C-alpha cells in the first residue's frame, strides 16, 4: 500500500515525529506501513502501533457517543446518517488493526510479552466494534476469546505485576462489566488482579514499581466506581 516505498526505519522514525506533533492518523499510517514490511515488531514498535491506533479510535469513539446520544434524544435522517458515517470509519479502523493482527503479527508472536500484547489489542478492538454493534454476539465472543487466550498465557508466563498483564486484566474487567453485562466477573477480576500485584511489588525496582502501581491505580479507580 501507501508506505511500500519508504524504509522500515524511516517509517518508525516518522511515527515518533508524528506522536510528538500529535498527528495520530499519520502515526497510525506509518506504523501500518512498518508492520506491512512483514518483520516482527520490537517492544517500542508494538507500543508505537498501539498508541497510534488508540489515539485514532479514541477520537472516533468520543465522536460516536456524542452523535448516538443526540440520535437517542431525537427519538430528518441527518443525525442517523452522520452517526453511521462515523461508525463506519470507526469499524474501518478496527477492521484495519484486526487485519494487521491476523496478517500476520499474532501467528509470528512466540514470546509472552509480544503474544499477550497482540491478543489484548485483538480483544480491545473487537470491544470497540462491540460498543457500536446492534452478529453482536459473535463480535462479543471474538473479544472474550482474544482476552481469555491473552489471560491464560499472562497467568502462566508473566509475574502478577507485569504491566502488560495488568493492562490486559484492567481491559478484560471493563469488557466483563459493560460488554458481557457481567459486573460481578469485572469486580472479581479487578480485586484479584490488584491484590496479586500488591503481594509481588516487593520484588520490583523503583522503576518497575512506578510502572505497575500506575496500572494498579486504574484497577482501583474502576473498583471505586463499581462498589
Amino acid at each position: 500500500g501507501a508506505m511500500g516505498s519508504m524504509e522500515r526505519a524511516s517509517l518508525i522514525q516518522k511515527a515518533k515525529l508524528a506522536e510528538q506533533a500529535e498527528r495520530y492518523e499519520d502515526m497510525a499510517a506509518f506504523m501500518k506501513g512498518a508492520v506491512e514490511k512483514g518483520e516482527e515488531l520490537s517492544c517500542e514498535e508494538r507500543n508505537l502501533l498501539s498508541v497510534a491506533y488508540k489515539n485514532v479510535v479514541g477520537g472516533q469513539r468520543a465522536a460516536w457517543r456524542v452523535l448516538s446520544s443526540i440520535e437517542q434524544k431525537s427519538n430528518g435522517p441527518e443525525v442517523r446518517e452522520y452517526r453511521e458515517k462515523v461508525e463506519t470509519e470507526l469499524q474501518g479502523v478496527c477492521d484495519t488493526v484486526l487485519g494487521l493482527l491476523d496478517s500476520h503479527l499474532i501467528k509470528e508472536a512466540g514470546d509472552a510479552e509480544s503474544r499477550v500484547f497482540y491478543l489484548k489489542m485483538k480483544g480491545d478492538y473487537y470491544r470497540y466494534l462491540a460498543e457500536v454493534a446492534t452478529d453482536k454476539k459473535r463480535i462479543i465472543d471474538s473479544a472474550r476469546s482474544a482476552y481469555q487466550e491473552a489471560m491464560d498465557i499472562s497467568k502462566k508466563e508473566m509475574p502478577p505485576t507485569n504491566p502488560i498483564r495488568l493492562g490486559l486484566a484492567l481491559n478484560f474487567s471493563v469488557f466483563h462489566y459493560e460488554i458481557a453485562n457481567s459486573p460481578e466477573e469485572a469486580i472479581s477480576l479487578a480485586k484479584t488482579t490488584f491484590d496479586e500485584a500488591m503481594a509481588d511489588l516487593h520484588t520490583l525496582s523503583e522503576d518497575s514499581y512506578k510502572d505497575s502501581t500506575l496500572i494498579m491505580q486504574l484497577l482501583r479507580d474502576n473498583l471505586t466506581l463499581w462498589t
Binding site: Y24, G59, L218
Partner: peptide, 12 residues
C-alpha cells in the same frame, strides 16, 4: 457515557 479506566491513552 461514564467511560471506565482502560489501558493507555484515554483519547476518547
Amino acid at each position: 457515557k461514564l467511560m471506565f479506566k482502560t489501558e493507555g491513552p484515554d483519547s476518547d
